[PDB]
Design a protein around this ligand. Structure first.
Ligand code: CL
Ligand code: CL
Ligand code: CL
Ligand code: MG
Lengths: 230, 230
């Protein structure tokens, strides 16, 4: 241990999209003197949306004050957006955190917690329209900073997000060393990572596959928004 | 129990580099009609090199016959390269698997198992010189295919590897749909992901940080290579 150790905490909830957590985890855990916490109601196993089992290391109650709080996205976001225990924890940690952050649909949770009002932010492309009712000003960029808020786009944007955050916590040379250790020189075999470049038939397939979830999440978002409006 | 599901297995071992497993796992588990296994000597918790805890779903003995075997890399591969039980599992699965695969330094395990003799393969850039003593034809590319062998480069190459494998298992349109769902249109904040583009100062800092591991792994590699004589 060190008096100056940086405390980084990820919310780990059932039906998280695990890459939203595990991509950033590997970038940030590599940084000098960092301790990374995986936070839920109690320590123990938590099942991600793929069926991969992750393990929370601390409860909300025992989590130390965080220098960075990060909300990963996933199917489980809808429940979180109306989880008073989780939202209260997020607001409490955000009061003093150096950085308040999210990846993918985790920004919808920051929105439900009241932390995006009047702020520019992004989220997963398929849910991007849900930012505005939460008070955010939506921006279509992969990593969006507004003061001490940092939000990443959909799933794999967590890697770009975390390297950006690494340079802010330390410096460019440190982020570059991590990027090289991860051999992060991506060369995607297709050009379908954005709805603006993917084949139109693939975009339609993706939207159809997401329509039921988007409908349910919109209902949740509007209830969360009405709470903020009152 | 979808009977025609592709059976995909990752070796999950102590001191795995978790992102070598969790990146490809999230890609492949998104495919239709697949079942993904995490295999170790027994089911239960397995701690990755960063301290992230993962959970093996099956023992070697209980694992079904796999269509795809995938060996992730990590600090723990040195032990695997001389682990007779793990090597026997790999060899028996590879004897009939439709695809034999690895990410990062997992190809050194395939090499120790005798499965790269005369075969084109890659690995993490910092360990690439360990391929030739194991009989491989070392190839400086991010994803290398040689018959039913498919190997990926260091850590984050797992995502590009897995999308390539997804198109082989299914088709391009299916792999594109997963790419879009993962929003995998990378925009790295630095250009240091390869030793060819990173600043030379950064390459030196990465090489020095890897030096003790490389020393240990070279000794193991030369013992494993001599055992390939018969
Ligand atoms: Cl169509
Ligand atoms: Cl390694
Ligand atoms: Cl080793
Ligand atoms: Mg079959």
């Amino acid at each position: 241990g060190s008096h100056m150790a940086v405390q980084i905490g990820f919310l780990l909830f059932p039906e998280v999209q695990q890459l939203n957590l595990t991509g950033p985890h590997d970038v940030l855990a590599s940084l000098p003197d960092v301790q990374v916490h995986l936070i839920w109601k109690e320590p123990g196993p938590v099942v991600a949306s793929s069926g991969l089992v992750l393990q929370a290391t601390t409860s909300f109650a025992d989590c130390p004050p965080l220098d960075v709080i990060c909300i990963p996205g996933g199917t489980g976001v809808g429940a979180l957006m109306e989880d008073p225990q989780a939202l209260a924890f997020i607001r409490q940690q955000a009061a003093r955190a150096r950085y308040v952050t999210s990846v993918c649909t985790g920004s919808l949770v920051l929105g439900a917690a009241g932390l995006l009002q009047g702020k520019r932010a992004t989220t997963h492309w398929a849910y991007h329209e849900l930012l505005a009712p939460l008070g955010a000003i939506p921006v279509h960029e992969r990593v969006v900073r507004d003061g001490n808020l940092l939000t990443g786009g959909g799933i794999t944007a967590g890697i770009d997000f975390a390297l950006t955050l690494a340079a802010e916590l330390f410096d460019a040379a440190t982020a570059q060393r991590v990027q090289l250790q991860l051999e992060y020189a991506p060369a995607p075999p297709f050009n379908a990572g954005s709805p603006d470049t993917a084949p139109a038939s693939v975009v339609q397939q993706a939207r159809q596959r997401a329509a039921d979830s988007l409908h349910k999440r919109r209902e949740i978002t509007l209830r969360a928004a009405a709470r903020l409006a009152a």
